[PDB]
Amino acid sequence: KKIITVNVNGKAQEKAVEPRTLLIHFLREELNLTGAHIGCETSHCGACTVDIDGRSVKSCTHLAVQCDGSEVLTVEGLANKGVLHAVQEGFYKEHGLQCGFCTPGMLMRAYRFLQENPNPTEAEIRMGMTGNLCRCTGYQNIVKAVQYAARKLQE
Amino acid sequence: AKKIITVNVNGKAQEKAVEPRTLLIHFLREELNLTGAHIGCETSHCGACTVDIDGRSVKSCTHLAVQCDGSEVLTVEGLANKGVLHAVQEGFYKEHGLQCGFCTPGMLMRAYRFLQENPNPTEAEIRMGMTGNLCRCTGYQNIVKAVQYAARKLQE
Amino acid sequence: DAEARELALAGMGASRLRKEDARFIQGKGNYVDDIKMPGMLHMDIVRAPIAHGRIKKIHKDAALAMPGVHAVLTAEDLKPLKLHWMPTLAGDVAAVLADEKVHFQMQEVAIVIADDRYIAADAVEAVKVEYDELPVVIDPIDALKPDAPVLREDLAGKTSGAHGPREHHNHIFTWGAGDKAATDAVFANAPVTVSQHMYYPRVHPCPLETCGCVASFDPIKGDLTTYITSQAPHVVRTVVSMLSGIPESKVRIVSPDIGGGFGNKVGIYPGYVCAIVASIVLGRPVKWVEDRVENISTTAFARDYHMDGELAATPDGKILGLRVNVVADHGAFDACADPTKFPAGLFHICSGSYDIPRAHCSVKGVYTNKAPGGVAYRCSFRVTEAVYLIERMVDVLAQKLNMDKAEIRAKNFIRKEQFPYTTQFGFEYDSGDYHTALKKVLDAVDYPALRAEQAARRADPNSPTLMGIGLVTFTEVVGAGPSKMCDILGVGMFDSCEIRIHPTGSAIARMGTITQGQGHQTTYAQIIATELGIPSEVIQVEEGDTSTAPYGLGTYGSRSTPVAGAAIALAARKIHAKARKIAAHMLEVNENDLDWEVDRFKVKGDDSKFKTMADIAWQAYHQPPAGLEPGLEAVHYYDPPNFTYPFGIYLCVVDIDRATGETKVRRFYALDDCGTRINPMIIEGQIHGGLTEGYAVAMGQQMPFDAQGNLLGNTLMDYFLPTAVETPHWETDHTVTPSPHHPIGAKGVAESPHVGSIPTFTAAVVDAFAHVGVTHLDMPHTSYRVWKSLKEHNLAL
Amino acid sequence: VDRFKVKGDDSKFKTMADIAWQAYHQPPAGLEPGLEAVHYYDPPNFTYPF
Amino acid sequence: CEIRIHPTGSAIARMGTITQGQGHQTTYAQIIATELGIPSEVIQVEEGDTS
Amino acid sequence: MIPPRFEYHAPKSVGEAVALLGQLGSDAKLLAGGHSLLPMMKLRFAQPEHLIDINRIPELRGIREEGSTVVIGAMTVENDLISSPIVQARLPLLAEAAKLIADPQVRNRGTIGGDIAHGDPGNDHPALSIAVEAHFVLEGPNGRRTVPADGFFLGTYMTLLEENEVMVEIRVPAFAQGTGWAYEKLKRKTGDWATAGCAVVMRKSGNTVSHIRIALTNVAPTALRAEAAEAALLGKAFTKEAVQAAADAAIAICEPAEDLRGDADYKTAMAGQMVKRALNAAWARCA
Ligand SMILES: Cc1cc2nc3c(=O)[nH]c(=O)nc-3n(C[C@H](O)[C@H](O)[C@H](O)COP(=O)(O)OP(=O)(O)OC[C@H]3O[C@@H](n4cnc5c(N)ncnc54)[C@H](O)[C@@H]3O)c2cc1C
Ligand code: PCD
Ligand code: FES
Ligand code: FES
Ligand code: FES
Ligand code: FES
């Protein structure tokens, strides 16, 4: 086992982990940050997406041990002092979620994508959100949710 | 500073680190979630926190957890074996020795030990032997019957 | 197969074992302090060291700087939410956190929130408070003096209160019942007249589990969930909703397993309000669990009635009138649990088990520098005081006329044929048979032989012990309900039950009451078992969760059996009527060609053609007969037509040691009649507990204050509670006189042993001194006090 | 919308809130306290959206 | 469906169905809202728990 | 309920415990059965910064006979006194009187040495140790010393014991054949401290009292030895008048505190009453 120190949502977490432990299970099982979900074992769905060291990453294809000294942000950390982040507000206002299973991953992705590209076109949004699957929405309202967040972020 | 200790509770090793002032009752309830033992006073009279430590009945609210490093602690959760109720639990059940159940875990742990100290107790001996345990609901009458029931079951 | 099928139901009348036991005997109960939630913090309270005084300054800095402490709140943090004061069940207001001043010692002044209870307790000690002492008021009589200090400066200028006009700043109310003029007329000319002052001491219900709660406001969902030691969770939800502004549907109150309530957990304490507020502010769970000292010192006390009784009669012992005057000590704020129209509860039931043609009572409540309360500890809303008054007065009358104490009662008893009897105070006693019950007790204990033995001991001047025989014949009033008459903060005192039968025959049932150990999960199931032919073992009952249980008024005043017991039977009967309709359809016959036999509907004249409740349940889900909705369930809200009036005949023999003053209970026989009995085993337990509490009150309990207002003996070091050694062996008996208006004829009974046994003990102790002219002795009858009396009457050793 | 008003006189009315409280305070003669209902619906036919 | 109105006007409702994302907690509240003049926002709906 | 923070020390020898008392000072307190110390700490009546647990010291335990002297280790738990076949045979007064102390649970923790060192007038052993003529062995930085029970109690919670000492054991002479004894304890309930109590140990000679010791419990700031009460019986015949004279002599020295157990008037009269009863009970036990 390797002792690591991961900064999760602004708080330092020193834990002893087995090398094979997937980051997604470390977050869900050890820290009880159950927002991130699992929808596949092949790395396609993106329901496990979290922000690691400034980038969107599918936590099911990353080891917890690799996060020693990293900065990890999960959906539970998006709201600031209880005030929703623009992406959370956009998804809510534009009905960008139904069963809510792909939502945390979608929000974590959108959170970073909007920093990568602040004024995205619809095509760029669809392409920028390609790593995340959704079975409920048909993506249309998600595009609007991201557009709503983009406008609010430059407000 | 927290002291690292290992206390055997119900035959299982419990490795923890607690401040020296930690009362055994809070250790069991707070650290191990063995919430059977209860707190009914701050003056050591009620006995609702009674647990069996190293072969003796002890009020866990008046004993330090740090004094138990290596001890054998028995709580109500460990009386039943393989699901079968201990004679003491069966006695309280059959004789209606409990109403709200708050003093019950303490009564059971005390009766468990009492019956070993005295296998064939008279009523006076039972009332006196259970004297360190307070009950607000029963009026004790059925509790002595429950103990008499258990005493009888253990001899058969 | 009929008698066997009924027996297998383990329903009405069966002494079946408890369904609750399993979890409790294995430490799997779920009480407030067993609860642990994610992010849960702990709250402790900084309390007042003095009884009366102005708050100069509160120091928060040292406590706040301490690691582990998240917040320190005072009345200032509560003002913006209008929560530094809260409304009470008595129509007055109580301080949540002391604002400008403190009204009683140990009062809540500030709160700290910390990582755990250890740090929290440290934080309390770190908070320093500066006070300006004010003159204390501990005696009710001294409180009404012109120069007496103003306790409640918040209601300065008010000439009326929630219960009528107020004559003095420390005067709360004056309430009366009966015919004053008629009563005064009888007493003005009656040939025999007796008077007796007696004090019913302030005592505490002291449940083994103290009060506490885990308040959890979820800022994400915007709803409040608080686990609490409450005997009326639904009422608490409505009140919390209105005081907080949070829509009621988003407020969930849940009374889990409660380690005894005994009326001590009916009200809302500042501790609950503070935990809720802190939780809202911190956006996380806050746990509050008081210590024993805090429970005895600040939660609801019982009694504290200064009473002056009077009886008018003819020389043969026939009572002509009753006149009573009482001064009630309610402490700082009037938070006395009672229906809004009865500031003195049902004290006007003090005419007792006797046909008294003229009576009148008057109660005056006053403020003092003490904790709120008054109604608790199995009192049935001041019935304890009412029964004690009349029974002591009857003994006084018997002694002045030199008349036997049993004889004078049999002479004044309401005759069996007089029921339903309307008293001089307006109560309509449902049913009773006192003469038969008294004879049963007298014969059982060989009363004449007891009197003979007593006569012999009294003869020898050197008998080392005094013998006293105490006898009480009382009538209770339980089942607070008629909405036109009874309401809690505006809510009619009804109750409810909801039963749902599953496709396979078993069922789930929820009521608006809440057990604290009296066995509802077993008994309620038994009532339904008999009504529907489904074994009680598979009828799961639950109470306490405002999100699942039908709205009710909770459990106190022994109202469960009378009110909820009725709602349960009626709800079940709604299901039984539908079951018949379904059975008739399946059997292809008319409904009244059907007979109900234990657990099935069978065709008259043909035993082979029948359908069981299981058969019917399945049919209800499979294919509902035309004109019927699928399913099989019912809900019923019962507004009782009258209270229930159980009675009892209690006898106690005591032997007092002349050298030490210590009293030994030689025998105690208790006969109770609560109508139809649901579970005898459970009833017997309630009696044992009740009689034990009575012994505790009459023989050892008290809450003395010194001249400075300090509460003395507020811990188990001095506050008396008997162990198995002190508790006598109880002898119980019964008769069955059903309540005519009740769906199953069952009356409440739980409070009877407490209400009746207390004056029985006093009756026995006083009767031990009767031969030297003693008419009354104030409780507690401790060795010390009894010795002072032996000394005073030259009976010492 | 949210109240029962007397025909003609608009000023005389009672909201569902007023009615709810009354149901708990003191039920009119012949009625049980409370304001709740249960209903099991066995449909007469399917629904045919297009 | 079982609907219970509280003393203060708000309500709780439970149905024998079980949403899996189709929005029953919002839509069911709207139906009842129009039927009783109680805002859908305070009509709390739940499903899925057989107890 | 919550005691203040403190450091825990658990030395395995009397010598090291004494050493800790020295280096830590008055800020340290010896932790025996904890059934007086912990309750006071929980109510914050006492707030030592250090606790020196003496439960792991073997020489503080054991009950042995050294000739005609019974030696009880200070750490002897209350219940072991009751079940000791030696105490039962040589000091039956202590085995029977111990049954009147607290409850079973407390008795499995509280020690005879802690009951005495605590110096509370409410405790039963102080008067018992006087009537039985016990001697306490104390160990400090300068070695040991043996002091008698009579004169060991100075005030409420105050004894001859120094801040840097540890009571090792309790030496008491075995009862001579035919010794009469008794302990009369008036109490509000089981497990409560006495309202008044009297310990009596006496020996007979034909029909006269040859040896007598009378001690009073909880009727003064400390346990009292009723010397004048003894003087009313020594060498005199055992009569009803003699007993009353003793009772009057016991009563005369009482200086009870007024509290919830009663006033000085009651406690004094009760002390006398317990004396009368103890003397008659003790006499009846003489052979
Ligand atoms: C509910 C209750 C009821 C009780 N009832 C009674 C009763 O009826 N009669 C009665 O007599 N007692 C009674 N007690 C007290 C038990 O009997 C007192 O337990 C014990 O007085 C103080 O002994 P301890 O062994 O527990 O030591 P502790 O509680 O640890 O106290 C020891 C005290 O003496 C010092 N000390 C202890 N051992 C030594 C030693 N070997 N050398 C030097 N100093 C030492 C400590 O520093 C401290 O000041 C009761 C206690 C409780 C909680
Ligand atoms: N006839 C008849 C009657 C009765 N029963 C039963 O018995 C029981 C009882 O009931 P009642 O009487 O009805 O009552 P409740 O309501 O239930 O209860 C209450 C009470 O109860 C008592 N007791 C008890 N116990 C216990 N255990 N716990 C508690 O807590 C208690 N508390 C107390 C009090 S106080 Mo108040 O509040 O002051 O007013 S009131 C009171 C129940 O189960 C029932 O069912 C029967 O069986 N039968
Ligand atoms: S679980 Fe599907 S990409 Fe991670
Ligand atoms: S909202 Fe259900 S999968 Fe996206
Ligand atoms: S909590 Fe009362 S004796 Fe332990
Ligand atoms: S059963 Fe409730 S205190 Fe014992």
Short mmCIF file of C-alpha atoms in Angstrom, two decimals, chain C residues 237 247-250 498 500 508 510 547-548 551, chain E residues 2 4 6-8 10-12 14 42 44 51:
data_model
loop_
_atom_site.label_atom_id
_atom_site.label_comp_id
_atom_site.label_asym_id
_atom_site.label_seq_id
_atom_site.Cartn_x
_atom_site.Cartn_y
_atom_site.Cartn_z
CA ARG C 237 -43.97 19.44 13.29
CA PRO C 247 -43.46 24.66 4.77
CA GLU C 248 -44.86 21.84 6.94
CA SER C 249 -44.60 19.19 4.19
CA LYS C 250 -40.86 19.82 4.21
CA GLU C 498 -54.35 3.72 9.16
CA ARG C 500 -53.29 -1.46 4.92
CA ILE C 508 -49.06 -2.58 8.20
CA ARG C 510 -49.68 3.36 11.79
CA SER C 547 -44.01 11.58 7.19
CA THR C 548 -45.62 8.17 7.40
CA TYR C 551 -51.78 12.90 12.21
CA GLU E 2 -52.63 8.81 -1.23
CA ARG E 4 -52.64 14.02 3.00
CA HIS E 6 -51.36 19.13 6.74
CA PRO E 7 -52.86 21.62 9.27
CA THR E 8 -50.97 24.51 7.65
CA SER E 10 -49.04 22.00 2.46
CA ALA E 11 -49.18 18.29 1.61
CA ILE E 12 -47.51 14.94 1.06
CA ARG E 14 -47.45 8.90 -2.51
CA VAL E 42 -45.07 22.41 -1.32
CA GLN E 44 -44.13 16.69 -1.61
CA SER E 51 -43.67 0.32 3.44
#
